[PDB]
mmCIF file with all atom_site columns, C-alpha atoms and ligand atoms in Angstrom:
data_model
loop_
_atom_site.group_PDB
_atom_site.id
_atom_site.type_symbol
_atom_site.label_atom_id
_atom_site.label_alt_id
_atom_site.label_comp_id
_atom_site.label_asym_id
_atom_site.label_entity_id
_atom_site.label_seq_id
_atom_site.pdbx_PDB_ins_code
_atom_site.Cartn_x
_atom_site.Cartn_y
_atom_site.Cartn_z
_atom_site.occupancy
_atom_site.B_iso_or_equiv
_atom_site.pdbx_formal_charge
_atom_site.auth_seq_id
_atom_site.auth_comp_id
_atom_site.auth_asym_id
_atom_site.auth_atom_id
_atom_site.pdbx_PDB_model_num
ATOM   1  C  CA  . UNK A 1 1  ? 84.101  116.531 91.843  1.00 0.00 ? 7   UNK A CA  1
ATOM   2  C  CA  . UNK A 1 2  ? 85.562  119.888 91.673  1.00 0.00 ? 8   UNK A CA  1
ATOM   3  C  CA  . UNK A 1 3  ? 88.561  122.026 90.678  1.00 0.00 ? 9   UNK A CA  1
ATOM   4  C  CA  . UNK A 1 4  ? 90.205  123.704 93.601  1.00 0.00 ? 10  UNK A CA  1
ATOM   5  C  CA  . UNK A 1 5  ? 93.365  126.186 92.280  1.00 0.00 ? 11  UNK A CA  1
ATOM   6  C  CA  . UNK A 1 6  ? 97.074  125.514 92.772  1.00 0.00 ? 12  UNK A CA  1
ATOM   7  C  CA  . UNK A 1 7  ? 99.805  128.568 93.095  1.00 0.00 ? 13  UNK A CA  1
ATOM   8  C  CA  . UNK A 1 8  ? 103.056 127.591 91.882  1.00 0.00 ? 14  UNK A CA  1
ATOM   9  C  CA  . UNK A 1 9  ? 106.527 129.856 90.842  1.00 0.00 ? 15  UNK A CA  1
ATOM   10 C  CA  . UNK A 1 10 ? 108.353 128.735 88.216  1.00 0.00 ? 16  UNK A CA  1
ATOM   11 C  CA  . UNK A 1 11 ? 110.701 127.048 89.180  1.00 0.00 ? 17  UNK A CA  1
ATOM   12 C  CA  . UNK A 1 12 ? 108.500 124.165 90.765  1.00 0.00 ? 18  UNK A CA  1
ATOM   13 C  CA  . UNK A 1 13 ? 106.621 124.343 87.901  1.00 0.00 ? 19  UNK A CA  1
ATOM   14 C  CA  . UNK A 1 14 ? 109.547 123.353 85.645  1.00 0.00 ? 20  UNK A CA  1
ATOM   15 C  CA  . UNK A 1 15 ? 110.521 121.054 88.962  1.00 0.00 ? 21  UNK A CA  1
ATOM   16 C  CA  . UNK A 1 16 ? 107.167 119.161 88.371  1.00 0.00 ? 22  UNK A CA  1
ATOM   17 C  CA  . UNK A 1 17 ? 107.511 118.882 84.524  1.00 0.00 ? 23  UNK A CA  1
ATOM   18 C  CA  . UNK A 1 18 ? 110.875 117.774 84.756  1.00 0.00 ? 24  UNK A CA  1
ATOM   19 C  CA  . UNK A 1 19 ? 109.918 114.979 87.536  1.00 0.00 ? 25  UNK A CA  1
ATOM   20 C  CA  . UNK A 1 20 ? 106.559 114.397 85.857  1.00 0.00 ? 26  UNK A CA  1
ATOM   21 C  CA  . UNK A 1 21 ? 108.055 114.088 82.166  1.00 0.00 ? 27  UNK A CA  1
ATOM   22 C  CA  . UNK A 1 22 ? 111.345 111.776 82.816  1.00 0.00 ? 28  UNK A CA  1
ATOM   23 C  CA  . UNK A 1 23 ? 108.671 109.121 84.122  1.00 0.00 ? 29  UNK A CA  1
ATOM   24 C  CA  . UNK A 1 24 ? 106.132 108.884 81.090  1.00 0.00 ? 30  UNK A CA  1
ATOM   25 C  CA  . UNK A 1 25 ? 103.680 111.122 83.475  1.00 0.00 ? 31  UNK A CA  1
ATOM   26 C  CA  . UNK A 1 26 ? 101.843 115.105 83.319  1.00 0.00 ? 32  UNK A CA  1
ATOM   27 C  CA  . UNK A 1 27 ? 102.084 117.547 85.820  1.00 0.00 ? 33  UNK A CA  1
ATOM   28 C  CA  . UNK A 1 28 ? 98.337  116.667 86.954  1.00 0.00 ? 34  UNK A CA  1
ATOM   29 C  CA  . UNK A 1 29 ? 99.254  113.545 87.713  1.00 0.00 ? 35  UNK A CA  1
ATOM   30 C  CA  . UNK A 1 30 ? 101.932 114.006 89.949  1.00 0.00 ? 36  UNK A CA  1
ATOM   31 C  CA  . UNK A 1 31 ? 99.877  116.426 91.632  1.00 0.00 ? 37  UNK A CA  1
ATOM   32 C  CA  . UNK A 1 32 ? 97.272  114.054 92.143  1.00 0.00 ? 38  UNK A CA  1
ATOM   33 C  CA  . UNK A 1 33 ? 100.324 111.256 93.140  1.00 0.00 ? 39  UNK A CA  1
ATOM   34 C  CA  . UNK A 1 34 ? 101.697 113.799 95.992  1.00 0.00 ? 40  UNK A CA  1
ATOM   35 C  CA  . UNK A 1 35 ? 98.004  114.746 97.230  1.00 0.00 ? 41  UNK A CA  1
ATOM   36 C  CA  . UNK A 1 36 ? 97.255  111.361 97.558  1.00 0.00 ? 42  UNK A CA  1
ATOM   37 C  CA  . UNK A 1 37 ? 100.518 110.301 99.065  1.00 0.00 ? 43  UNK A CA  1
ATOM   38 C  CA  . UNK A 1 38 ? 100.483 112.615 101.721 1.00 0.00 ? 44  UNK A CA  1
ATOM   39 C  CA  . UNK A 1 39 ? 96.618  111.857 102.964 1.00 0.00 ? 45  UNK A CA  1
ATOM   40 C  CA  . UNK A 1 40 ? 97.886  108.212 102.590 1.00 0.00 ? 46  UNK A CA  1
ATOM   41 C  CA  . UNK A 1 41 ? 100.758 108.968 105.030 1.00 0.00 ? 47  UNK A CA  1
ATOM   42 C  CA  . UNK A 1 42 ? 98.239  110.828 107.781 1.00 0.00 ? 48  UNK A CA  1
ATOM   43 C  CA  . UNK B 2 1  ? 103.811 132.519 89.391  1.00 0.00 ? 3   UNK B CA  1
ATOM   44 C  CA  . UNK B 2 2  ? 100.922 130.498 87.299  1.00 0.00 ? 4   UNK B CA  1
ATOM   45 C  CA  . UNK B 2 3  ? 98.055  128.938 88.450  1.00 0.00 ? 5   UNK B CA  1
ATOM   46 C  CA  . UNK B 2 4  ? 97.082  125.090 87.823  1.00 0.00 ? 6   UNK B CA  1
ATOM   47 C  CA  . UNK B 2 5  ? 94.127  123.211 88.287  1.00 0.00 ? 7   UNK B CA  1
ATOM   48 C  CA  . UNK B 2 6  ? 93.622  120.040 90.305  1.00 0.00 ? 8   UNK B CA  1
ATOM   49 C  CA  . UNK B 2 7  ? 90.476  118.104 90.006  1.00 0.00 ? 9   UNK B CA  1
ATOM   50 C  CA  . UNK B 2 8  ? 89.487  116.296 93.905  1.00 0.00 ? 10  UNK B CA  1
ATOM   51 C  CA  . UNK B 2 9  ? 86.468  114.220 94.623  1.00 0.00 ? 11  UNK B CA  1
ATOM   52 C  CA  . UNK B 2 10 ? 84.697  115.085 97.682  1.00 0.00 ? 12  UNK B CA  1
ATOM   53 C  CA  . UNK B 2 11 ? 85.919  112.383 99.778  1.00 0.00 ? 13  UNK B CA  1
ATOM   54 C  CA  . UNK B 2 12 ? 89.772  113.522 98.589  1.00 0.00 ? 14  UNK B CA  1
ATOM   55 C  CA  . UNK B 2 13 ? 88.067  117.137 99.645  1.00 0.00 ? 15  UNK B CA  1
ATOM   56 C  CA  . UNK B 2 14 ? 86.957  116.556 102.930 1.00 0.00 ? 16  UNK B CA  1
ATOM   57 C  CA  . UNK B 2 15 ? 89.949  114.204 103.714 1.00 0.00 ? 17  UNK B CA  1
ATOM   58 C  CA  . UNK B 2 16 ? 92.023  117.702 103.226 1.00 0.00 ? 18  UNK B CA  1
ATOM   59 C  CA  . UNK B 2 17 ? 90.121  120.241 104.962 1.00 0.00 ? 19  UNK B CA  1
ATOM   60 C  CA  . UNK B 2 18 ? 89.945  117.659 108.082 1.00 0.00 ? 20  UNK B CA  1
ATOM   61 C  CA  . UNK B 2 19 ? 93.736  116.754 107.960 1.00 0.00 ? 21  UNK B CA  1
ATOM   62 C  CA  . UNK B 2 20 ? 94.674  120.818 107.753 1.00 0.00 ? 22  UNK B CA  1
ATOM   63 C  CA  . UNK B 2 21 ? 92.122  121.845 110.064 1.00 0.00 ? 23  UNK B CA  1
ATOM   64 C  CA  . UNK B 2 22 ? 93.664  119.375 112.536 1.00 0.00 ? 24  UNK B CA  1
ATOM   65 C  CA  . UNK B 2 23 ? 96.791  121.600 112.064 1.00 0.00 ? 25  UNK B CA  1
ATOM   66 C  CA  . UNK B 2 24 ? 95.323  125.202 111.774 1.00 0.00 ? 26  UNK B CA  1
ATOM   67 C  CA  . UNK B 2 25 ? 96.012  125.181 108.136 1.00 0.00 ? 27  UNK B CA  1
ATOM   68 C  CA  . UNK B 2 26 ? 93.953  125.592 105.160 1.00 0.00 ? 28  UNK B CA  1
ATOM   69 C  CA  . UNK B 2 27 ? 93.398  123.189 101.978 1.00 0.00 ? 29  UNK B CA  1
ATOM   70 C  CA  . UNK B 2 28 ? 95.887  124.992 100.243 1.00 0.00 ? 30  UNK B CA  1
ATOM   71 C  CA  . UNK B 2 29 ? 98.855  125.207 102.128 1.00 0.00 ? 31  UNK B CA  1
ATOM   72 C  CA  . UNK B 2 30 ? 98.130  121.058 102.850 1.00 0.00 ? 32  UNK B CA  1
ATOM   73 C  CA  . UNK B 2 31 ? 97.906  120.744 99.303  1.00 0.00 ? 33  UNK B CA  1
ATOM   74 C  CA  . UNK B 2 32 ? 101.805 123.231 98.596  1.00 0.00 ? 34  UNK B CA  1
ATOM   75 C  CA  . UNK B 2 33 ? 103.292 120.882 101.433 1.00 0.00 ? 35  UNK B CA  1
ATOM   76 C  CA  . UNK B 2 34 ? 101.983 117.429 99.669  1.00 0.00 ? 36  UNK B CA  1
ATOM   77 C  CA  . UNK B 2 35 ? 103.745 118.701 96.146  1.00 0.00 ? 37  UNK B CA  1
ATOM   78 C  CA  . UNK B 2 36 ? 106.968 119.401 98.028  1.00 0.00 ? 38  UNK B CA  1
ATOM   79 C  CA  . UNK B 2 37 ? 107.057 116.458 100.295 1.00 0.00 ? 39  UNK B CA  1
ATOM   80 C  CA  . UNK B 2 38 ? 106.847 114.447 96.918  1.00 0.00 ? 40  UNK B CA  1
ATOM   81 C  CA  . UNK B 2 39 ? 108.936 115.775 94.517  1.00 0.00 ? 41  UNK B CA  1
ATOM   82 C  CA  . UNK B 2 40 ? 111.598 116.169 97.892  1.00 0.00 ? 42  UNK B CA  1
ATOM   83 C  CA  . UNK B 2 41 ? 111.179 111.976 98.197  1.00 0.00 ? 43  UNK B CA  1
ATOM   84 C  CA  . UNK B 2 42 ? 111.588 111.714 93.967  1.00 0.00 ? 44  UNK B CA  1
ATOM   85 C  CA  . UNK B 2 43 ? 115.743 111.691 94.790  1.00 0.00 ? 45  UNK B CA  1
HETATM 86 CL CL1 . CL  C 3 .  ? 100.209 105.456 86.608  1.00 0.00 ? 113 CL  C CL1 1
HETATM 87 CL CL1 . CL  C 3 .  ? 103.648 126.605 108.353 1.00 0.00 ? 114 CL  C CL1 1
#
């Protein structure tokens, strides 16, 4: 394991609480959901 | 702007850096594009 950094402005910030929060969920994991997701996907 | 941590095991690690590499893209513009994509498909 390791901890790689993520930028993010405000606004997708508050985006991710928002989406995170109205579902019972954190901000890390949705991250983790939409990392995931998308290598799923490829 | 603030920046978060995300915790990835290697084989998450390596899945990135191939899958961006493929594109001519680094780890963390892969990882900016899978947060948009998703909260884009939440609605
Ligand atoms: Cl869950
Ligand atoms: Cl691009």
């Amino acid at each position: 394991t390791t901890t790689m950094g993520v930028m993010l402005d405000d606004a997708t910030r508050e985006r991710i609480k928002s989406a995170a929060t109205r579902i019972d969920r954190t901000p890390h994991w949705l991250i983790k959901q939409a990392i995931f997701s998308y290598l799923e996907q490829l």
